Amino acid sequence: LALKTIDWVAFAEIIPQNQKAIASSLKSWNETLTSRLAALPENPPAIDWAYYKANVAKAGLVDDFEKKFNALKVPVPEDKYTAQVDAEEKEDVKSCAEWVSLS
């Protein structure tokens, strides 16, 4: 978990008027995203076996279910979105650097 703390009026100070709304939308997303993170814990509670080992009289159903579950690996998706924003940040850094030198 790597989250960068942020101001927000400072954010508002650096939005060109042509694209306020999307930025604001972005902003909105953040907040609801944060809520959606606090809306559920990190890991689900793993289903025990003994409670089902001694109650599910079905043959092998609990067994093979638990096994295929342990044999299940959820696809943890990769971003492929951070590198491009990093590069855009780099270009913006170059631009503001030359601007501030000239100023």
């Binding site: 060109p16 042509n18 972005l26 696809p75 924003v85």
Partner: protein
């Protein structure tokens, strides 16, 4: 003494047990709940982020 009687001579109550278990299923779901579940995994949407 029911090893010989799979229901021990009920001779009825099937006409209601059918509906009871049908409703129990159709409220629990509609798939083959006796098999292992399959899973499709969607992925989020995105957009242009840089200055247009």
């Amino acid at each position: 003494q029911t090893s010989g009687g799979p229901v021990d001579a009920s001779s009825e109550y099937q006409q209601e047990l059918e509906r009871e278990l049908f409703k129990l299923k159709q409220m629990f779901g509609n798939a083959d709940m006796n098999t292992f579940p399959t899973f499709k995994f969607e992925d989020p949407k995105f957009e242009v982020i840089e200055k247009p």
